[PDB]
Design an enzyme around this catalytic site. Structure first.
Site, PDB file in Angstrom:
ATOM      1  N   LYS A  24       0.859  -1.150   0.000  1.00  0.00           N
ATOM      2  CA  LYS A  24       0.000   0.000   0.000  1.00  0.00           C
ATOM      3  C   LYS A  24       0.862   1.155   0.000  1.00  0.00           C
ATOM      4  O   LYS A  24       0.820   2.028  -0.855  1.00  0.00           O
TER       5      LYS A  24
ATOM      6  N   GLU B 134       5.005   8.454  11.479  1.00  0.00           N
ATOM      7  CA  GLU B 134       5.801   7.762  10.535  1.00  0.00           C
ATOM      8  C   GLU B 134       6.676   6.793  11.183  1.00  0.00           C
ATOM      9  O   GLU B 134       7.154   6.991  12.284  1.00  0.00           O
ATOM     10  N   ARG B 135       6.946   5.709  10.451  1.00  0.00           N
ATOM     11  CA  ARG B 135       7.858   4.710  10.852  1.00  0.00           C
ATOM     12  C   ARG B 135       9.124   5.267  10.414  1.00  0.00           C
ATOM     13  O   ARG B 135       9.374   5.458   9.237  1.00  0.00           O
TER      14      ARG B 135
END
Lengths: 466, 480, 54, 509, 237
Positions: free
Chosen positions: A154, A180-181
């Site tokens: 995705k 956010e990662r």
């Protein structure tokens, strides 16, 4: 004004402000705060007390502390020098390439154009993904809601789209990694830099990165969103530049909001979901569009809380959509990349007009085929299947084939797939399906359609199968 | 100092101003804030006033003086909103400067009396065959437009609106329907296109667009319908026929709940407050088809509900359901198939639609409706295969996509054909094609006839023979 | 033929049940969930989702 | 008001002007204690997040600095405390002692070696209040780490610095799996594999001590315990303690990472924590949300988990590799906490009972087992065979899908099944099965070149052992080489193959 | 309060139309919160039962007239476990559950037959002719539901034949209940056809006797008494 921390009950910092107070939203800097710990007055909690939100860590903080109102809400750097910068909510280069010396700072509450003030018309952009164009064509300013699973691809898909587009489209970008990662930002970083989408040779890029990672306090994660939002309006109106606004994840924004609402000792509605769920969005979403001075096209990731969409949040989301790509997990699971749902991977803004009337019709026919086909699925599911009638069986196959054909390989995940990605010219797509509609791939099997680009290659692929 | 008509903002949540003082304020007074904002002293608490802030602040900081306006709300109402996009305060976000509406009328005014009211008998039409046919509809009437997303939904309203063009721009005094589109929480963009669209479509001159866009503060968004409502009554009671399309109340409700909750005035089922049926009920009860005293006028309500996954069991939908005089249920699969109409017919309902519409249509439609039932039903027999044939023909025939409204007569005509199975002697694709050609054919020729059919209010037998003949001639004569 | 058919009928009838069997299983989840979803949801309402916090 | 402080010992002197007490700012008197939330009166200047100490030797943490009192989460049990009690600050927030003299320990998370050494306490402490590294601080996970579990190491091959979800049901060998790895890490740690000087951190969340006890015993047995902290929050616990445990570990592991070393944390599991914590929240009244869980259970974790990473150079490049565990219940994934975790985790490891019943321990749903990370987590050795194999298995499985009308439909598919099955035999592994790569690839090699595909499935395993003992015996040369070349080198392959064919010949015959 | 006047005072056999008590109860429930009170499960008002009770019990047949209470009960989602209806039943004497399905089956009367009940019915009270006819009817139709399950396999004109007969009869029976409306030219077109009771009991009793087991099936639809249905068959062909 200066206030005293009267309560920190979690990051709800109640400060009673004592040289008066300014209004709400006004950003406070906590005095004695190590870094600039901005608290944003959120509420006048009354009694010259505000409920404020800390966006920093509060650990180790002596309560009773003194906060000095920064006297306005938070302002953050604006100007082009932000492209190729990872900014945190509070400006602050988390690119960490040293400062982003900008000439403009902006308070992150940016506003929406009145009716008259916004270009009241749409466009049709396109994307080169079969599935997309065909079912949800594009336009500019348009906020697309993208559902499904990061890294199913995705998230990857988003990138791929960026990958062709930002480059190709000039009109700047904002990437908002909300919760956010960090890691994902890192890798990506080396890649971007590399990629020259991000240019560091020139502070700018074509794209500004905003990362507001998960580990930030929610307030920060929630707020990093406005921040980015503020920027794109800057780019649009000020810079012309037609932002593609990547939001990953507006739900993660939201989550930060809801969580917050709760703590805000408010009533965050059903499922815990913030009372204001909508207003946060409305106010925000309207700060996005094709104004006259450009378009902020949103690519909005919405990862689905508890994976349900009947979920109010997505319910809300829908109100602002322009195109929606709802990836189907089922499809994804069916080993299909793209992961599409072919029933609300949509644009209302597909019309015979907006796309070819053919495009559209072909699509309607297709949309039909799938739609009918699904109907059969249930039956088939129960009952085996074969006596429905063959034409349908044909459609079925066709649909599957179509499915497989919608599966469109990707280069960026060629690494994984071994599949050379394909971004597909519009015709090939239209044709693709038309051909299929003509049902020509008689003999040709399902998997001959898996992960190809232009439809010939599928035909070809059947041959490769042979 | 008034802390009895004026208050100091004790606390302000961020939209609920707890205001110390104000007392002497009368319940549900519009107040005005020292942030220039408006408020309503909604909650007369024994201490302070929960003032729902009709505005956006960070202007307010506590202590702000909250001033009475001393007024319970009225809205400008009139008839000059026709050709106007407005916001609920009566300001006009059209940016056409300000409106022509000028009389003001409490949105708080309620439901007509029975005698003041006078039952529907008055048709209502959309240019959409399926609707007009399959819903037999009058004006005054609530009919729920229920469906998820413009999926043509919104289109649906438009085609109708556009359809009214011929009538309002016709001298159909009776079919001079002031369209009120209360745009509740809609993106500005949507509206933009829309606005544009309608404008391009210009139904808009005889149209109010009340526009509460997506951003818009919740009580406002909430308010807008009531506002609209006051305005539509403005026509109603004034003989005229207003159509308010409440678009959409789901969003209103939400906002409203939210509003409640912020007032910490409790939720209810699905976290939604208890009055919420009532909410609409009182609102919609203010809609009516009047008696003669009101010039017989009407306010036809096409409220809109956006379902979430077609879930209507849903308290609020159920609520609404129990009020409406039917629903226009839309089903995706057919839409998606491209079938516009997309409707789930079964789910679209008129409890007793037929008592306020038109013989013409009726004469063919009753029977037709039935045939379609039969056609539909059966999840070969020559009959059934036939029904299917027909049915499919008729599907095309009721298929008028988005962007397709009509004068009725055109519709009855084509319907007639289909009900004579004339169409069954054609490939279904060519029904559509035929229909187009045919239509321009009768338009050309038998505009005579159509004019007449429109005239008779019914289909004459005579006309039928001419028509039959026409149709047949076209049919046969363009059957290929 | 008829032997074949009848023996096939078992087969068909099997088939069906294989399908069944699974589904039946699955539904049973769908179940819990909708149940729980429910239970829980109310338990919310209950947990002053209608009480203290009306 | 709050009838607390209307305590007329409290009031009863403010009135008087006869007040002056505990500190009520740096110490407090317990207004009430109940619920492990010691409303402790006073505490003003009180540090935030501060660890305090109770007049019970129990620790507490000052969560809500309320203007009057502190909602203090209790690090003990309040049967061991009572009302009024003086809580004196420790001044400081939590740090946990951190260092290295924990490798070889079972401690309680309070850093007291419940093993029975008592604290072999670290000189240093390191903040649990510490947070995740930045983007820039990180430089990509690439450093493998291989469990000695062929299946894993191949198909969801494992990097380092990572965060990969271990998901599976009621000791479906789950733990068994963790052990085989742990034992496996031994050789690297018995190497002076400084890249893989993987200090193992076992966060035990909620495990009743006996469960721990075999396990630890196992670790002891694996002696892997030597490079291992066992952070132990058993079933007997106050909740925060279980809650705390990961965070504790978190301070500790990032240290290795940042000191270039490699830390491995096993969080087993956050399911229990989440519950506990949520509960804790809830007990704190402090919200729920979806599934009754507070929304910031995500934040909680998210924040927790960002702290595991594979670092850049500044940090010695090291890692704190996270192998988080969630124990599934019926693969419940919209199961909010799973939903979350999935989006966080950089792939996930599905375990399946059926496979387990099949004896297939390990029980993996491969299809779903994914390393979102993927390629970065490997070694070419593996890449070269595993690439094809994984793929071949993909097909096999697809065709295990399509195996029931006759699979002798096309040769390939029959084959895929035969072959597949062979490989299947290989991928099941005993309990206590750490492994070396060269064997693993060796064994894989055999199959992917189908030699085992020319062999009865039962004997595949049989071979495997035999083959192993064989290569171990003779082709120690080669094993050395595959390790040496770090890959299967084409030569090593040729020798290997040659071995295989002969061996195979010896095995089969 | 008014009706009690008439009942006792004016003696009157009151027909009391309530539409809907549901809205009352609901109204109660709405306030419940706002009365500070807890509402209830399903949102309700905790006191619901008494509210009802006192009310339902408020009305009756004294030996001072009768208030015959025709009480409309809106039943949300026709969900009746929906506490309100769940309660209601106790206060009911005859429960008329109208079946939307049946309505959907096009039937008007659209009723839910088996759930339009009166716990009261008896081969004594209503006489067995009545009773039994009903029990037979009730029986067969429920069994017919069991048969639907069959049909799902077996098809529009293919089954096990006796059973087919009964099916067909059920199909008639269905139709035979269907009855015109004088009011509803709007729903029916038709004009009401009233069936005096015996003609009914008999009507079905006869059908049960299968005397039309060669008559068309929907030559039963939207009728008055059974003869006219026979008549109606002719009118076709």
């Amino acid at each position: 004004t200066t206030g005293r921390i009267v309560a920190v009950i979690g990051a709800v910092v109640d400060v009673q402000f004592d040289e008066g107070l300014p209004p709400i939203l006004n950003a406070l800097e906590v005095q004695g705060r190590e870094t600039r710990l901005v608290l944003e007055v959120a509420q006048h909690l009354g009694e010259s007390t505000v409920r404020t939100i800390a966006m920093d860590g509060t650990e180790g903080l002596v309560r009773g502390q003194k906060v000095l109102d920064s006297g306005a809400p938070i302002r953050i750097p604006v100007g082009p020098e932000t492209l190729g910068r990872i900014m945190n909510v509070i400006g602050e280069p988390i690119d960490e390439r040293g400062p982003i010396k900008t000439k403009q700072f902006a308070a992150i509450h940016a506003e929406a154009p009145e009716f008259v003030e916004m270009s009241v018309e749409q466009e049709i952009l396109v994307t080169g993904i079969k599935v997309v164009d065909l079912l949800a064509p594009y336009a500019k300013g348009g906020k697309i809601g993208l559902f499904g699973g990061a890294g199913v691809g995705k998230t990857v898909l988003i990138m791929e789209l960026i990958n062709n587009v930002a480059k190709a489209h000039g009109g700047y970008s904002v990437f908002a990694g909300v919760g956010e990662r960090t890691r994902e930002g890192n890798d990506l970083y080396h890649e971007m830099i590399e990629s020259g989408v991000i240019n560091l040779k020139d502070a700018t890029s074509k794209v500004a990165l905003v990362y507001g990672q998960m580990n930030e306090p929610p307030g920060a994660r929630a707020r990093v969103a406005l921040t980015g939002l503020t920027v794109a309006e800057y780019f649009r109106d000020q810079e012309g530049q037609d932002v593609l606004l990547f939001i990953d994840n507006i739900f993660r924004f939201t989550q930060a909001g809801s969580e917050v609402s709760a703590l805000l000792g408010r009533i965050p509605s059903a499922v815990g979901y913030q009372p204001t769920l909508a207003t946060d969005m409305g106010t925000m979403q309207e700060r996005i569009t094709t104004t006259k001075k450009g378009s902020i096209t949103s690519v909005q990731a919405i990862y689905v809380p508890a994976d349900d969409l009947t979920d109010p949040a997505p319910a809300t989301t829908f109100a602002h959509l322009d195109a929606t790509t709802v990836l189907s997990r089922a499809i994804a699971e069916l080993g299909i990349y793209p992961a599409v749902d072919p029933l609300d991977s949509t644009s209302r803004i597909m019309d015979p007009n907006i796309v070819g009337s053919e495009h559209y019709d072909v699509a309607r026919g297709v949309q039909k085929i799938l739609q009918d086909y699904k109907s059969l699925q249930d039956i088939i599911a129960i009952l085996g299947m074969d006596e429905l009638s063959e034409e349908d069986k044909l459609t079925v196959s066709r649909a599957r084939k179509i499915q497989r054909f919608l599966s469109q390989p990707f280069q960026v995940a060629e690494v994984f797939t071994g599949h050379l990605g394909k971004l597909v010219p519009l015709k090939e797509t239209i044709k693709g399906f038309q051909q299929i509609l003509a049902g020509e791939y008689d003999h040709l099997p399902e998997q001959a359609f898996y992960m190809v680009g232009p439809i010939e290659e599928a035909v070809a692929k059947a041959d490769k199968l042979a | 100092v008034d802390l009895e008509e004026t208050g100091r903002v004790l606390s302000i949540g961020d939209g609920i101003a707890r205001v110390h003082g104000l007392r002497n304020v009368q319940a549900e007074e519009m107040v005005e804030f020292s942030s220039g904002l408006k408020g309503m002293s909604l909650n007369l608490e024994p201490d302070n006033v929960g003032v729902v802030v009709f505005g956006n602040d960070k202007l307010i900081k506590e202590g702000d003086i909250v001033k009475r306006t001393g007024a319970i709300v009225d809205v400008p109402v009139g008839e000059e909103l026709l050709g106007r996009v407005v916001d609920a305060l009566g300001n006009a976000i059209d940016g056409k400067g300000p409106i022509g509406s000028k009389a003001r009328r409490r949105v708080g005014l309620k439901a007509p009396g029975i005698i003041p009211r006078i039952s529907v008998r008055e048709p209502m039409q959309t240019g959409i065959k399926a609707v007009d046919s399959l819903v037999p509809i009058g004006r005054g009437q609530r009919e729920l437009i229920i469906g998820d997303r413009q999926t043509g939904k919104t289109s649906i309203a438009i085609d109708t609106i556009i359809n009214q063009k011929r009538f309002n721009d016709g001298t159909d005094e009776k079919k001079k329907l002031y369209c009120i589109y209360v745009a509740i929480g809609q993106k500005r963009s949507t509206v933009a296109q829309l606005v544009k669209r309608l404008t391009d479509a210009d139904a808009m001159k005889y149209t109010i667009v009340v526009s509460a866009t997506a951003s818009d503060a919740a009580p406002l968004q909430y308010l807008a319908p009531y506002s609209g409502c006051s305005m539509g009554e403005y026509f109603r009671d004034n003989g005229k026929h207003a159509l308010i399309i409440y678009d959409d109340l789901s969003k209103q409700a939400v906002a409203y709940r939210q509003m409640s909750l912020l007032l910490r005035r409790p939720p209810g089922r699905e976290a939604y407050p208890g009055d919420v049926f009532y909410l609409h009920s009182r609102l919609l009860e203010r809609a009516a088809k009047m008696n003669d005293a009101f010039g017989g006028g009407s306010l036809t309500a096409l409220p809109v509900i956006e379902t979430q996954a077609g879930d209507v069991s849903a308290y609020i939908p159920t609520n609404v359901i129990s009020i409406t005089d039917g629903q226009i249920f839309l089903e995706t699969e057919l839409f998606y198939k491209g079938i516009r109409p997309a409707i789930n017919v079964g789910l679209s309902v008129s409890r007793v639609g037929s008592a306020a519409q038109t013989r013409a249509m009726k004469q063919v439609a009753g029977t037709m409706k039935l045939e379609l039932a039969q056609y539909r039903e059966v999840a070969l027999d020559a009959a059934t295969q036939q029904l299917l044939s027909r049915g499919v023909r008729l599907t095309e025939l009721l298929k008028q996509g988005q962007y397709s409204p009509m004068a009725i007569e055109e519709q009855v005509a084509v319907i007639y054909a289909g009900v004579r199975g004339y169409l069954d002697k054609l490939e279904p694709s060519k029904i559509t094609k035929f229909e187009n050609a045919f239509l321009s054919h009768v338009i050309s020729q038998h505009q005579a006839l159509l004019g007449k059919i429109r005239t008779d209010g019914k289909i004459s037998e005579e006309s039928d023979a001419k028509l039959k003949e026409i149709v047949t001639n076209f049919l046969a004569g363009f059957e290929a | 033929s008829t032997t074949s058919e009848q023996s096939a009928r078992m087969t068909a009838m099997d088939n069906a049940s294989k399908n069944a069997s699974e589904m039946i299983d699955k539904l049973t989840l769908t179940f819990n969930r909708t149940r729980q979803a429910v239970i829980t949801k109310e338990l919310i309402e209950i947990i002053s989702g209608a009480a203290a916090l009306d």
